[model samples]
Each structure stands twice: as C-alpha cells, then as structure tokens.
Target: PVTINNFNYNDPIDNNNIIMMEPPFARGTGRYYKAFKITDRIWIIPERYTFGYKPEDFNKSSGIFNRDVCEYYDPDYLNTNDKKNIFLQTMIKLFNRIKSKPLGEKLLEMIINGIPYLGDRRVPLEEFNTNIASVTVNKLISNPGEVERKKGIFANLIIFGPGPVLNENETIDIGIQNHFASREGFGGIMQMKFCPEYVSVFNNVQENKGASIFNRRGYFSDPALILMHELIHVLHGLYGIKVDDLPIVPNEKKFFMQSTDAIQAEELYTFGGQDPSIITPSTDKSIYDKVLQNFRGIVDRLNKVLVCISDPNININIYKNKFKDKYKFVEDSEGKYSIDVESFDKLYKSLMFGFTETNIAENYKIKTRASYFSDSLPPVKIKNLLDNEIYTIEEGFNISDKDMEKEYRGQNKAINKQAYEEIS
Candidate 1:
C-alpha cells in the first residue's frame, strides 16, 4: 500500500509543503524539479561541486530537472576597443624605439630626401617634414577620414604623403602612377577595390587568426620588404633593364632563382643583422658571406664620394683629379653640372655588382651591359682592375690598353655597344 502524491503539470508545486509519505516516484511527476534545489539565496556553485551531475536531467523533456551550472572565464578574449588600444600602444612603443636608433635616423633622412613628387625628385628635409605633417593632419579629418580608408594609414603616410612631401613642385602624372604600379607588378592590371567589411578580415589574417581570403586569391602581404623588392624592379625598368628579354641558358631559371634567393638571403643574413646561427653550412651561407664582403668593399669606395659631396673641408680638387682620370667629363656649355659617364658607370657597377656580382650579372645582364656601354668602355678593363685590386680610378687607367687587349682575348668581340643599349 503506497500513498502517492498527485501533481498538476501546469501549476507551481512548493517543495516546503511536500513530505515523503512512502517510496517517492523517481521518474516523471516533477520530483526531479525539486532535486535541483534552486533557491534565490545561491548565486554560483563552487568548482568542486560541478562533477557527477546527470546532464540529461536538465533537458526540457525531463520536466526541468537539476544540472550543474557552467561558467566561462577566458582572460585573452579582448573586445574591439581593447584590441585597438593594444595595437596603438604597440605602435607608439615601436615609434619611440625607432627614433632612438641610428639606422632609423638614416632611414628617415633617406625618406625625406626621396619624397619630392614622391619618386620623381629629391626634396629638402624641412619641406618634407612640413608636407608630411600637413598630410597627417588632413588624414585625421572628417568625411574622407583615415580610418575609413581602404589601406591602413601606414600606406597613406609612407607612400602617398611622402611623395608630396619630397617633391611638392613636381606635377603628379600618369607616368608617376605607372611607375608605382609597375613596381608592384600591377602595370596594365585592373585596380582591386576591397569591400569595407573585408578590412577586418585582412587584419585577422595579419594577426594569424585565420587564413587570408585575399591571400588565397593570390594577393600576398604587401610588407616593406616586398615593396622594396618591387621598387628595385621599377628602378631597373626605368633604366631599361628588360628582365623578360634575357636569354635562358641551360638550367638558367633554376640558376637565376637559386642565385637570387642566395643573394637576398645573404643580404639578410650578413648586412641586415640576421642571426648567424640561422645561416646553415650550405650554399646559402657561402653566398651570403661573399655578398656581404663585397657590399662592405663597395661601401668603402662610396664613402670617398660621400665625403667629397658632404664635407666642405675636403679638397674637391682630389675628387676632380680622380674623376678626370677614370672619366672623360663632358662639361655643360650652359654652365650646368659636367656629366662624367665613367664615374657614373663606376658608381652604378659598384652599387649593383660590388655585393651580389653573380646574381646581378645573371639577372640584370642587359642593364649591366648597357651601363658599361654608356661609358664607351669594355668589361675587360674593369675586370682586370677588380682582379688586380686597383682601388682608385687613376690606378685602373694606368693599366695599358695592350694589357686589357691581352686579358680580354677573343671575348672583346662580344662587347657590342649598340646591341647592349638596344637590349637594355
């Protein structure tokens, strides 16, 4: 004889009024609801109390049965405002650090010098600063604001602003636009217009949160390194360096890729302050060391020119003598600056091949040959001078034409000035 309590499904059943008279019903009849013991007094449970609870009893099908309460507590999940603040703070710190370094100062000077008409002509430092400040202020204004801009403020600051800052007098034209476009390998390509919503998507990819949709579509990171690399291409193009026109010798593509990679890696490893431990005991290491040494040597030579140009106390006559010996100077009859094709070639070759000789020769052979041809000189003399450690322009000229002819052998016939200029 079991006395069972009758329960109504739609009505509230107070637990304090109920008493267990016999064996209580465990399955249905709202008994499981009372087991929850949810009172207004208790807010949260202790972590230790969360285990051994039947999860299925909490289901609506079970008539509101008791279950363990869960809580989320992740400190790293920052909101949008928090993320913005953190990024701003990081940028501030980076700016401060950069301002305190010599390399940073030099970079700033170079940028200031390079800015007039933004790649058209060099400008005074004071003018560049003023222009940059104006641009920065304009960028922060209403309507067409900086934040709403497609690319970040960095692109505007570094690219668009710097050009006007450097060369305010120069007219902005399609040629300048083409130059920039060509540098990014975007010549004749349609301009991509990104949706405003996709900016966050790009930021997420940069922070490594997710794979980039644009990157998947072949748009890669437009970092400073990539920009520099592309700018080099533009510079070569301006000088008539036709990379696509170059003949492919046996295994040429592989050789070119390997050589280019080696040159870049070496430049990074040695001159760019990369850790030596990362440079392996491979071809990469050898290439990097060689390139670095060559670069330092060229820098040593350029220091003389820099001293002559920048230092007032230095005797200009010494530079003139050296200049005259190596180069046949064609004076401007209108009293403008004299043009020395030999001096120009020397500087160009030193800059191009002094560090990454093999790689530059292989990839930019036409341009290299054109530069040589412009001086009305053969490669034999330059090669001989380099091999014999002739450091001065005078020292190079002292080596007789007969000696150059002997050194060149049959290879002198290959030095065709017209062909070199045409290809370049």
Candidate 2:
C-alpha cells in the first residue's frame, strides 16, 4: 500500500517548506530525489526510478542511458530550458558510471510493481491505458450492433448537474464528455460543472462570491460518492436495475431532497429543509436505530448476493473467486483485509465511511452524497448478475481487453434479457 505522509503548511505560499518522500521502501527499492512543483501540487521522482527502459529489455541491451532524469520542457514546442539541458548533461555523465552491468534491473522492478499499485488507486496513466487496451479488444470480438443497443438504454439515467467542471473555459464540451465518460466508466468518474444558476446564497456567503467554482475540496468536494452515484446510472443503463432509477415525481422536488438527505444521514446532509418522518435527530435514540437499520439492510442484501455467487455449484463462482482474490485492503493501523465476498462488502463499506469522515470527502460535499447514494443502490441483484456471469467482477478488476470483451457481451445480454423479462 502507498502511504503518503501528510504535510502541514504554515505559510501556504512558501514552496520550500514542502517535503517530498520517496515511495515506500518496503514496496520498492528507491532513493528519495529532489521535489518538483507545478502550481500547488508537487511531483517526486525517486533516484532508482528509471524511465524509457522496458522491463523486457533487461539482460539483453547495453545498460548505457539507463538512469532516469527529470527534464522540464515546454509542452507546446518541446523546448528545453538551460536548467533541463544541464540536468540532461549531468545524466549522461551519471549514466556512464554504471552502464555495462545490470544497474537498471532494480529500477525496472520498481516501475513494474508501481504500475499495478497506481492502477488500483485509479491513477490516470494506468486507467487510460487499461481502458484503451480493453476498448480496442472489445471492438474486435463483440458485435457492434449489440454494444450500441446497450448504450442506447444507458443514456436515459444520466443526470446533468452544475457543480465542479473540469476546466472553466472548456465547460460545455468537457462537461458533457466527462458526464458521458463517467457513465461509460461504470460510474467511476465524478464530474461537476460550475453553473451560476445553481449557486445558492449560502454558498455565496461561504465563498464570498455569488459566482464561485468548487473543486474536490472546499464547499463542493464529493468525487468518490458522486462517481458511485453516477455508477448507479451505469448499473441502470447496463443491468436495468431501477432501484436507483426510481421515477422523479413531478412537483415533488421535496421527495428528491428528502430522499437524498435521508440516504446520506442528517449529520452529513446540507441544503436542509425539514427532516423527513424517516429521519431521527442527533439527540434521539432513533438516530442510532435508523443508522443500524440502514447498515444491516445494506449488509444483509450484500451477503445474499455473495452467497449466490460463491456457491460451489455455480460455475460463476469459480471465476468470481479468482477476481475476488486480487484485492487486499490495508487499514491505517497496518491491518490488512483480503478481498473475499464478505471482505469485499466490508472493505467497500469501510472505504465509503472512511472517505466520508476523512478530509477527502469533507473537502467536497457531492463526493459524500455520491458515495452514500451510490452504495444505496440494490446490492443483491447486482450480486446475482455477477453469479450468472462470473466475468462481470473479473473484467472490472483486471480491466484487460479479453476481460472487457467478455464483460461487454455478458453485460449486454444480461441487461437486454432482464429488461425484456421485467417489461413483459
């Protein structure tokens, strides 16, 4: 697990105070190097972090030009500065120091191990590559007609809201693309677009502006849960599970607000009106009762699906077990939890809460709601689908081409079959 040491800022503007550490030494062998900053974010490249060297090329090629060096350049023109030129020159000299032998092998191991770990964290580099590879292969084996048929159904449940847009200037195009991408990515993406219309007076007071944009932190933060909610959209799209597709009752915006608040719990709920009959105030014993009831309802439904999928008689369990084997969760106390069916539910629920209470979710409101509502979608039915088609979770885990093709095919078939049966 990659653990980031938290940095405390005294004077926010002072960049020199920021300390960058190397990737955990236990996970990979690497030395801490100089820190590079771009705006508020800092990038750290370790000493043994070699680039441009493929793991497969080891033991065969001459180890010249082996070490990795950071080169800052103009992205527009690819022009190198004097500092970058000097760094490159220094790297050439350094490369000669250990060129002939297997000096790069340790670095190769670091890079290889680091890639999958980054993937689990949903790092953009790993995600895009995995997605592209899966998409390319899925196009080859799956029938395009069937795929398009599935996409048409998924289009209805999409919700367009104004909150956190990716880039201010490129709002319309990027926002729509992001929304669609979130839907297609199985609700793994959370997007917000700044809309002046949606801005409230309270938000204006908090931000000191009538028109302010929100990020993953501050008054607007909520990516993970929002992604999860959007994923419910995908679930509706692909599986025809209408638990999240409950009809939007006209002139009943009150219900929408109440349901949203109820699902998220009052402590986390903002934009409050009156609490619904279903909700209990913090002072009431009913508050604990409601929380426990909700928690058990969620856990019980999840357990049912797990049992269905894991039954030895089911062929799907064979593959589902393999998929479950790939994940292990480590808590803050260094406690590790393996990814079995029960563990998966526990890990997910824990992550949902952990992300919520942690500064990560608090920084962004929509993320909290997104996480909460996304989890509220029916779990048992989803588990049943997994049981019928073992490839569902497997594809989501590996995110490989072969897995995706199998997933897309199984998903479309199951979805269409369910919709037809349900409609009939």
Candidate 3:
C-alpha cells in the first residue's frame, strides 16, 4: 500500500503529513526541525545531515560520555562538508534507482509494506515512532532508537541495539534486535546504520569494481546500490515477518553459516542493476566467484554421494573400497563407517537452497509473502513415481545465478561456429 516512486515531489501528500517539531532538543537548538511522513511506514528526516553532533548538556551527560573515541564527537571533527549533501542526495538516488529495476522495485515494496505497526495504535504517529525514526539528521536531533540504533559491540552473543554491530566488517549494517514489548512470536525491531566514512563515498563516481563484495572499500559511485543491498537486509528482518531462516542444503552449512545475505546478494546481482559478467565468467576468477566455486564444488560432491545413497548403485563393499581409497573413512557413532542419509539430506537442503524436508513436504513452502513480488517463479512440481503422487518442490539455488546459455554466444548473441567447427 505504501509507495515511493520517481521521487516526484508533485505527488499528493496530506497537509497533516508535513510536520514541524523538535523533540530531543528545542527548535532553535537542534539541527532537525521538519519532517515529511512519506507513508505510515516510511519517514524522511534529512535535517542536520551532519556527521555526529555534540550535546548542549555534555556536562550533565558526561556520565554517558567518553573522550573522542565515542560516536558522540564534535561534528566539526569530520568537517561539515559534502558528506552531509552526500547522505541527503543518496536517499533520492536510491528511491530513483528502485523504480528502474524489478529486484529493487520489489525490495522497496517489501520494505514499505512489510513494516508493522505496534499493536496499540491509538496514536497514529506512535506507529512511526515505535517502528521508525525522528525526521532529523544526527543522534542529537533525531528521535530515539525508533529507527537507527548505535553501532557497538554485542556482549558475548546478546545481539541487539548497540550490543552487536551486525556487519562490522561491511561498514554498513541493518541491525536486528529483539523488541521486548512485542508479544508476537520472534517480533523484533530493525535498525540501519552507515559509517560516517562510508556515507562519503557518494561524492564521486568510482569504477564499478564489479560488485561491493570485491570492492571491499565501499568505494561505490552509486550509494543507491549499497542502500538496495541493506534494504534487502531490512526486508529479511522486518517485524513479525522475518524469514531469513529459510531452509538450505545441509553440507553447505559452512558456506551459508545460517545467514541469508548470500541469497540476497545473488538476487541483487541478478535482478538489481549490477554487472553479472564481472564474476560470471566460467573461470570463476573473482573473489566472490572463487568462494562460490569452492562451495559449489563442495555441495556438488555432497549431492553426488547423496544420490549414490538413494539408488545404491555400488554395493557396500565397493563403496567402502572406493571411499577408502578416496579418503580416510571415519567411524560412525556405532563404530561403523556410514553417513546418515536423512540428516545429511536435511542439512544439505537447508544450506544450498534455503529449503528443508519439512518445507518440501509442505507443498514446497517458499514463504511467498517473504518474496511478495508477483513475478517470482512458482514452486516446481516433482513427481514421485514410487508413490504415484506429485509434490511441489522449490527451486534449489546456489550463490550463483546467471546465464550459462550465453557463455557460448558472445555479445549480441552471435555464436562463432568456426571456433567449434575445428576449421583450423
């Protein structure tokens, strides 16, 4: 129901949607003063788009304050330069880019629509405050943790708020934390944060080092691409609708590590405007390609052994003979050399394709609401000849999704038959 397309200012918005107020500080004191309620689920607060700000009552709050190492530092420390404009301009750029592609278009829709209002909604604006942010720039002027949470260490495994800064290495994060008030099962809040230096990447366009994974510096000319990636994270963490735990293949657990970011990145590169060719060459040359290639091979071997288990092509003696020469065979719990087929299948499906046997049993439940896009392909139906019954199966996916068909046909779809004809 909520839409943000074209960044067209001419779009009609209720006068009530335009609000002027100062919450954390008074109107004259803080940098934020105005806000535009884009929708019930989304709000824009670009005021005081400076780095971080200093509090007027630092003396009173010195209990919470440390030295310059803290996030609450002097705004001038970074110099109030184009970073402010870079932050503001990138929002428009992301919204604009969302309109141009299917993946981003659906991503924007999911983020806006999937956002939930707190149970008690007497205060129409309370929904936004509880779920989103203050229409301000920095920590001082903006509302509380309603939208953005601080990036800090998570104590041991208590991952939330300032507890664990989710993508610490990635420089950008949409942190997921538990919301104690929500009675809904697994209901939690989502907060996004961008490092001060990372936001500065928008000042100039940089060479597309293929994708952000390879370009570890966050040197993106278009911050919108970065936003699109983070928004996918946001979509996965939406309150009462979190679905990142979708099933995958078992043996691939290490490659996936119980995280859905890999799938999200694949979707972004496939449908979102990134160049697939950068890493899609058959050589598997790029860093991402190498990671995928290794994982793919690992999963492929697991699948092969799993298949051998199903049909029992080789007798136990033959299998033992072959495996003994292949590698050192380990004893099972009963002091026998064997693999648990059921357990291995579950683990493999859970890791490789984001599906489990339970999911496959349930009409291959792909959690359609999780995707929300109407154009998504339907679950494929696989017939079980042994049972004389048909069951639907979700498409299994590795981290890689591109066109192998195009490899032979170079640019413009023209195939050079002479290369294959042995013409010498």
Name the top TM-score candidate: 3
Per-candidate TM-scores read 0.23, 0.22, 0.33
C-alpha lDDT of all candidate models, in order: 0.22, 0.23, 0.28
User: What ranges in model 1 sit over 4 Å off?
Assistant: 1-82, 95-101, 118-424
Please estimate how well model 1 matches the true structure, expressed as its whole-model Cα lDDT: 0.22
With candidate 3 superimposed using the best TM-score fit, by how many Å does residue 94's alpha carbon deviate from the native? 1.7
Q: Lowest summed-lDDT stretch of 10 residues in model 1?
A: 192-201
Model with the higher TM-score, candidate 1 or 2: 1
Taking the tens digit of each residue's C-alpha lDDT, what string does model 1 give over 1-424? 1111232222233432221110011111221111111111101110111112343322223224532122111122222444323322322222233233343333333222221111111222112121221111111112223233211011111111111011110111112323432121111111111110000001111112244331211111111122222223322222222122212122222211212112223222212112222334464344434433432322223233323222344454454343233222343554223434456556434333332212222221101111100111111111221222321122221224424323222122233111111100
Candidate 2: TM-score? Answer: 0.22
lDDT of 1 at 303: 32
RMSD of candidates 1 onward, in order: 32.5, 25.0, 23.0
Off by over 4 Å in 3: 1-17, 21-33, 38-40, 47-74, 77-86, 120-190, 195-222, 241-424
Which candidate leads in lDDT?
Answer: 3
lDDT of 2 by residue, 63-137 (tens): 345321211111111123433323322222222221212322222122122111101112232121222211111
Q: Distance from true position, residue 43, model 3, in Å?
A: 1.7
User: Order of all candidates by lDDT, from best down to worst?
Assistant: 3, 2, 1
